[PDB]
Every structure is written in structure tokens, then in C-alpha cells.
Amino acid sequence: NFAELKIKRLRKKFAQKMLRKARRKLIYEKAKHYHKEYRQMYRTEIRMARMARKAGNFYVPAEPKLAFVIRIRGINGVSPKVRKVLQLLRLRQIFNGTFVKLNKASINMLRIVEPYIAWGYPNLKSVNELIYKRGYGKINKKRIALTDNALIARSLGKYGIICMEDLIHEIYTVGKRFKEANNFLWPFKLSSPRGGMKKKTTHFVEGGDAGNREDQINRLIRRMN
Amino acid sequence: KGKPHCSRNPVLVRGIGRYSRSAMYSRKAMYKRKYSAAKVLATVTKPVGGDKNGGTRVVKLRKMPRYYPTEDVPRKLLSHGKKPFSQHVRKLRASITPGTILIILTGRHRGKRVVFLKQLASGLLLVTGPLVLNRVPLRRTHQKFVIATSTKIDISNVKIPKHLTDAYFKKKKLRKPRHQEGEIFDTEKEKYEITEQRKIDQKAVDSQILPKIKAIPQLQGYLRSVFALTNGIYPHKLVF
């Protein structure tokens, strides 16, 4: 039965290799399609603004639906409500970052913890840098580095997210399974901001760092990780 | 079997080929090169000889160990890199081109100005600030421990001998065979001897380097002089 069992193991290994090849091709084509979608959205915003300006009107862009929140103050002397909301945002340490889906409830929570955080609207590059350099998964309650696509697939494949690109797409374009994809990510442990901060104790619009800076959160992220 | 071909995928950036997967498929013509279907003797038999010793003997090579140590060390994991020194790529600073005047920073020839000829297989430079000028023979040196000046001579179309290699310039030693405990001093041979082959090579190289040095004024005086730091001058403000 030796020849037959050799044939069995060769057939099993070959089927496994073909399955891996098919999945890799699928991942490649999904990433290509995501690239097409990203450039379509980026050009669409410009085109809409251009036609409004040609007509002499104003094109108001959609209010951003994704935010990046970074806790900037430490854990000493925190009021109970601010402490609770920071725990619900999973910011239990200074220079911890989390993606937040923006709506009325989340925005009001951000207003509650406004002095303790700096938040803004990340762009595609910021999402890519954050997921690729500091992306860790919460797999079996453990902080596991996203070194393989199988780690994402085994935890989120039931939602259709099977690769780094799928995770980045779901985070960037806030999809149906954004809650699952975001909670799968361990909160980002960012370094100290290289080059320093302006003033962590005051709001951004008064020369400090706390509060909502609209899109300067990308500059903060570049210096931060 | 067939003749090996060139890569057919030019490298534009390290790790990335110029052509895609389908492009390289068409370039390789994989559409028609499709295939579907179609040791060492451990023991040796030797005639032992002698009457009624049986026919022969099946003598195995690599007999089992006579002794086993009380405990061993587990084997290492695999590193997918870490090439030996002989296989390392050799990098040369862009300021060091053949014919450049270099300044030695270490050794007995400290501060002397020599002429660069070629990088060797180990990356060590081969220099000869000609022996008639500053007593520096054909000698190896390290590019990390030299300063490449701006003055150069055109040492193209001169013949560096082929045998001038790392094995040629490698140091030789005498000690210590046939001697274990030192009760009689083995300090003999400590006087290094300049080989006649080395003298011939030095003469051959210098006879064709010197006329090009004399071709520009007082470069021979420059090479005879040694480099030094005056109290007013600072190496970061100096153009070499």
C-alpha cells in the first residue's frame, strides 16, 4: 500500500497548493479592485467640487465618517466619566490610537473626552501606515502581530475580510462589519510625537493639541509612528 | 538538456523585475513549454584473502563512533541568509577610483600618501605609494582607514600583474609544528624576508606608475610629504 499512500499524500499536497494559489490570486485581484475604487473616490471628490465651481455654486463634501483618536494625557487624576469613556474607546494608555466610526453617539463621547484626546480624519496613507507598521490583532484575547494573512482570515473571514487589504478597506470605507474589523485590531501603541507637541493642555484651535484637528491628525500620525 | 539563457527579466529595482508575470510568461513562451509526465555505495565488497576465510568481506565505510560524549548540543535553526565572508558583496566608496591618491591613517605607514590601484577580492585596496617615494610597497589597506583625496593620476592602460591577489598578500607564519612546550626560544624567522618575487613585482609596477607621477609637477614631492593636522586646520573644513 506504499505506492497508494504516496499517491494519496501527493494528491492532498497538490490540492492544498492549488487552493493556496487560488486564494493568493483572489487576494491580488481584490487589492487591484480596491486600488481602482480608491482612485475613483479621490477623483470623484475633485470632479464634484470642479463642477460646482464651474456652475458658481458650492459643493459641500460628505461629513467624514472615520476618525482616528489618540489619547494624549496620562492616567493620573482623571474624572470618572472621562475615565469611563476612555475605557470604552479602548484608550487606557497615553499615545494609544483607535479608529472610531463617527456618528452622533461617538461624537458626543469624543466631546466628553475632548481635553484628553487629539482626534481627526485619517487619510488612506495614514490608515495604511497604521495597519502595516503597528497593526496587531486581538486573537484569542492575545496581542498578535499581523505577520500573515491567515491570522486575519481565521478571525474575520466569516465577514469577508481575509487580508491586510480587506482590513484596510473595511477600516477606511466604513463598511458593514466595521465594528468587528475595528475591534479585531488591538489599539495602536504609538510612540511619542517626534518633534514634540505644541501644548497638550489646551485645544488645537487655541494653539494646543487637544480636541478635533480636522485633517492635521495625519501630520500628527506621521510624527507619531 | 538545453543551453542556459540570460534572465530575460531585467532588474530595474532590487527585488523587482521590469516585466510582469504574464509578460514574462509570453517572453519565456511557457505556452508551448508545457510538461505533464515522462546512490553512493556505503559498503564495498573486498576479497579478504587467505584460505577458508569465507569468500569476501562486506566492509562498510564510515564505521559507527567508538565513543559518545555524555551529552550533546542541539542543532541550530535555519537563518536563510548570513553568507560567508568570501561570498559577501564588496562595496567601494565613490571617491576611490584607480589612480587616486589616498592617505593612510593607521599602521607604520601612518599619514603617508599612496596611489590606489585596485580593489581586491576581499574588498581591501591594493596601494603602492611608490617605494622610491615614501617607502610604501605593494601593500593591502582598508578603505575604511584611508582618506581619498581629490588628486588623481590616470593609471589606466597599466598592467597590474594577475597574481597580485589576497592569497599573494596574505601573511605567512612558521610556528608551531614539531614543538609543544617552549624551553628553547622559537624567536627565529621573526625577521620577515622580502621575497625576490615581491621585489620584481614592485619594480614592475613602479616602472610604469612613476612616469605618470612625474607627468604632473611636484606630485612626487606631494607623495614624499606626509599628512598632518596643523593647529589651525580642522578636518571637517578641509577639502581633500
Partner: protein, 128 residues
């Protein structure tokens, strides 16, 4: 010359000095053996800067090199010849010390047997 251990890793000591007891320098009645300070105002206990350091578990040695002698072996105490053959199979990692109260004629035999068994002794010439 000397017998060599199986492996000789670099032994890293987090601290090389001793943890002396607080105020053991000011009194002869206070030995240098470490005692945890439990005074209400004790600045050493409170860990003020520039004070005597207190031992804690962070100073623990690497488990691979713990109890290793500078030679790379680990010490085992033997009282007679019979307790020496337990190291016959631990030859390349454990070395024997003859106990301090073993007589000269007995430790001579212990040393000879250890030389036979290739077992290292850290005090081979100790009563002669």
C-alpha cells in the same frame, strides 16, 4: 588543561554588588544582611533617589546562566566517592566540590576518582 563545559554562554549579571542593609554602615550591631525596611518614614523603603536600593525580582538572573560558576559549570557538593558517580552522566555541565569537613586522605581518593571519571573539581588541591 582544565576540563571544559558543554557550552559557555556569556553570563550577564544584572547587579554585581551586594544589597547591604539600610544603616548597616553606621552601626556594628546592624549586620549587612538584607532586611526589608518597614519604618513609616523610611526613605529607603519609600525609594527616594540616591538611597540604598532594595532587592526585587527584577534583578533575577537569566535562567539559562543561573547558578553558573565563572568556569561555566554548576556546583554540586560531594562528601565521599560514592556521591561522585552521580555526576558521571552530568560530566559536561556539573563540577564537584568536596565538602569542607572531608579528611585529606579521603579527598585524595575523591580527587583521583574524579580525574578518572573526567569530573571537574573546583578544589582539587585543598588538604595536602
Amino acid at each position: 588543561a582544565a576540563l571544559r563545559p558543554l557550552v559557555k554562554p556569556k553570563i550577564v549579571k544584572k547587579r554585581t554588588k551586594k544589597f547591604i542593609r539600610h544603616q548597616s554602615d553606621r552601626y556594628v550591631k546592624i549586620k549587612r544582611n538584607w532586611r526589608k525596611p518597614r519604618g513609616i518614614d523610611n526613605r529607603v523603603r519609600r525609594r527616594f533617589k540616591g538611597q540604598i536600593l532594595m532587592p526585587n525580582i527584577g534583578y533575577g538572573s537569566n535562567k539559562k546562566t543561573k547558578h553558573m560558576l565563572p568556569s561555566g559549570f554548576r556546583k554540586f557538593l560531594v562528601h565521599n566517592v560514592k556521591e561522585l558517580e552521580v555526576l558521571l552522566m552530568c560530566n559536561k555541565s556539573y563540577c564537584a566540590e568536596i565538602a569542607h569537613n572531608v579528611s585529606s586522605k579521603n579527598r585524595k581518593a575523591i580527587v583521583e576518582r574524579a580525574a578518572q571519571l573526567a569530573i571537574r573539581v573546583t578544589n582539587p588541591n585543598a588538604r595536602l
